[PDB]
């Protein structure tokens, strides 16, 4: 009923480690919403990470290909980001944002992402 | 009040046999436009990935995972809206919960069964 | 398991500018803003008599009596009070849920939600631009207004209450319902009435026998119009000048369009020749190729804060286009064939009758017998899963719920057409 | 212009003294059908177009304000031939009289524009 | 009754100029799109120009871009097709049409132009 | 047009049949670009929509305004007006200028003036 996006699954890992983030959606259905993952490190811009459209069309930022996998459980109305080979550079708060039907671009997106969560913290440090 | 799924995948069969034994899996799709779905069987063990075993299209074109080739046969009834998996020469490694998937051929949405246990042991 | 209409609307709920708001439709500048309800993404309901879409139908005055056809019904007072508008709104939402509760209806409504009218409105080929008649202006609580794209409006009927139809604004050079682009569809419809028909085919296809013993399930009627909207949103409607004369009387000169025959389905839809069928599919396969080409050559976008690549991806989602590693779009013939066959052969009135398990005219070439007042909003009268044929009552069998004699408390005959 | 194949050729206008009568006539050509309703409209100098008398094949007749009792409309069966017998004419009946033809339609049938004649002048002196 | 009366056509020399006009009556003109078609004796009808309801915007078939100009006067319910650089192919019967709702298209009588 | 201010004036004590002209000075946004509504409230009662005006300048009347009250706007002065005539005791109440079309309830994001008192008594 009420609109909500809740990221979870973050934490502190070491370089080379693994984390699976969750993005639980309420108030709307993934049958008609794309979900993109974003991250913001302290002092730098937001950057796109990956997006999975309503028909499960999938895209990745270059710096993340072969390391992260985005996936989806429509029955749970949840999108997941499984992150392997984490590097210090991957540190930051990770957010998921919905967009109607289709994914935006990895960079240069617009207002198509109309709602997002409070984020979940990912720290990668020795 | 509450609304249920538009389509119900009713799986049946499976069971427990010894190595080399046979078992049949079946799934009745209730209420679906069966024609616009690929029908597939998957299997999953706890903590592991749900993996494809076999799929078949509305025209009855089949696709088998390497493990299923030569021992499993998947079939489809477009009048009754059912999808069957006949397993033969079963091995302990085939032990898993088996799930039927109705996969919309245009990517609109999917339906998944509840899961049916298959146990192979001596 | 999520409802199609995820919120409870009452006609008197205050506006919020998002899913309850006063709206204006394009090029109806002198129209008064009307209260509207966004029951689902891309789908709005306006509980008003349609005096707006056609400027030559700007009031509810009937024609002179001699000029009214037998199958017509006029009551200028219908849908004038807040209580009727509340009941109309909840009747429409309930019908949407009934449709969405079948796999066929879920599928159709999914097609409708993703059938966004194409952004083909610029004189510059490489510039994506909305067409303004595929938008409404949505008035906000702060008094500002925002232009919003939408696929579907359900509106109350014009002076003829029973003239249910699916219309859309045209364009100076584009025939949007037949070039693959699509356009916003306005469906004049009412859930407050339904039509009497006859279980005997001999009688149902005779223009004067019987008085309409059985009541059409209004979910089928709505689904019928939604099937037209599906054809029109994907720009694959059959030209209305392709018709066939009703050869059973004849000097009346009555004709039905191929678009109608296709929409009804069943044995009807086999009157369309197999040679013509393949030709229509080829034509629209080429129109889908043209749209993918236009998208590949798109260099800019105007009139939105959304990115160009997102808007390109919107239409990849609509037409189910393939994309290669260069980002180029193409039409996959297997997916287009399935999409086309689904829109035209799967989505039919006859197939909705099979999924609803209701009694229904067996052919489009029948004759209306009566119009009844109904009230489907109370759950003791009509349900999402059963319509009138409530499975937990004596109305469960023999379509007793649609039998206007057995279930006579649920139907008031307003006019015999015979 | 496929509808422009139907033509409403109208005859029988002219001059008449007040109190006399005229008979207007209209035959349609190019129709593979029988009109559901046919009738007559008029337009008097400095005033808009108003219904005089129209009749449908079920026998329903509609009239403008002063027509019933004076003006009799008739039709040759189901043929597209219609007559207007205008008795007790008066000077303010002066104007142009147009033929009108309306095809039948049902809820599910194809719709067609209505047919209109070019008009013929009626002028009654006082 | 909706009527569209077109005129301004006739016999023209290659390179000559023409102004087609259409008088519209019987419908709410400023809510209708206006089109100009043409049809040679042995060829199917062809759309040549269309203008938005308000005169906002117009588009043209390729064969006439820069040579033909379509316009409308919503104060007088008039539409025009000003032509120039006429070519022996441009000879055909030219039709003006008006439409607001798709499939509800009102047609004019036609005017023959020869080059 | 984020920070919005609306200041009404023109209220007064009038005898039946009399006339008043209400005005509302708007600041912080372009008044001519919004739908605005005149609303009234009698003591202990709900809000009654009086009239609205569109960005285009078209005014629409509620029952109390019809044939009696003219709603208008001076774009350059960012000011809305309600010319009242043939006032009657039942017109008594506080009169507000409020953003939105057909406004008759306080809605988050809507802005209101402070109101001006209209009293019609003999
Ligand atoms: Zn239809």
Author numbering:
A (entry chain F): 0 to 125
B (entry chain D): -4 to 117
C (entry chain A): 0 to 247, 251 to 420
D (entry chain C): -3 to 122
E (entry chain B): 1 to 115
F (entry chain E): -1 to 120
Paper excerpt:
All BoNTs have a catalytic light chain (LC), which is a Zn2+-endopeptidase that specifically cleaves neuronal SNARE proteins and is mainly responsible for BoNT’s neurotoxic effects, while the heavy chain (HC) mediates toxin attachment to neurons and delivers the LC into the cytosol. Here, we aim to develop single-domain variable heavy-chain (VHH) antibodies targeting the protease domains (also known as the light chain, LC) of BoNT/A and BoNT/B as antidotes for post-intoxication treatments. Using a combination of X-ray crystallography and biochemical assays, we investigated the structures and inhibition mechanisms of a dozen unique VHHs that recognize four and three non-overlapping epitopes on the LC of BoNT/A and BoNT/B, respectively. We show that the VHHs that inhibit the LC activity occupy the extended substrate-recognition exosites or the cleavage pocket of LC/A or LC/B and thus block substrate binding.
Two potent LC/A inhibitors, JPU-A5 and JPU-C10, bind to the deep active site pocket present at the LC/A β-exosite where the cleavage site and the C-terminus of SNAP25 become associated. JPU-A5 binding buried a BSA of ~1033 Å2 with an SC score of 0.686. For JPU-A5, its R103 inserts into the S1’ pocket of LC/A by forming a salt-bridge with D370, a hydrogen bond with the carbonyl group of I161, and a cation-π interaction with F194, which is similar to how R198 of SNAP25 engages the S1’ subsite on LC/A. Besides R103, G104 and R107 in CDR3 of JPU-A5 form H-bonds with S3’ and S4’ subsite residues Y366 and Q162 of LC/A, respectively; T102 and L100 in CRD3 interact with the S5’ subsite residues F369 and L256 of LC/A. Furthermore, CDR1 and CDR2 of JPU-A5 also participate in the complex formation by interacting with the 60- and 250-loop of LC/A through hydrogen bonds. VHHs JPU-C1 and JPU-G3 both bind to the anchoring site II of LC/A and inhibit LC/A protease. JPU-C1 interacts extensively with LC/A involving all three CDRs, displaying a large BSA of 1010 Å2 and an SC score of 0.686. ALc-H7 binds to LC/A and buries a molecular surface area of 715 Å2 and displays a high SC score of 0.764. The CDR1 and CDR3 of ALc-H7 form a clamp that binds extensively to two α helices of LC/A (residues K335–I348, residues D102–R113) constituting the α-exosite. V28 of the CDR1 of ALc-H7 interacts with residues L103 and I348 of LC/A which should thus prevent binding of I156 of SNAP25, while Y103 of CDR3 of ALc-H7 interacts with M106, M344, L341, L322 of LC/A and should prevent binding of M167 of SNAP25. Structural analysis showed that the CDR1 and CDR3 of JPU-D12 form a convex surface that docks to a concave pocket of LC/A primarily composed of two helices (residues L310–Y321, D102–R113) and a few neighboring loops.
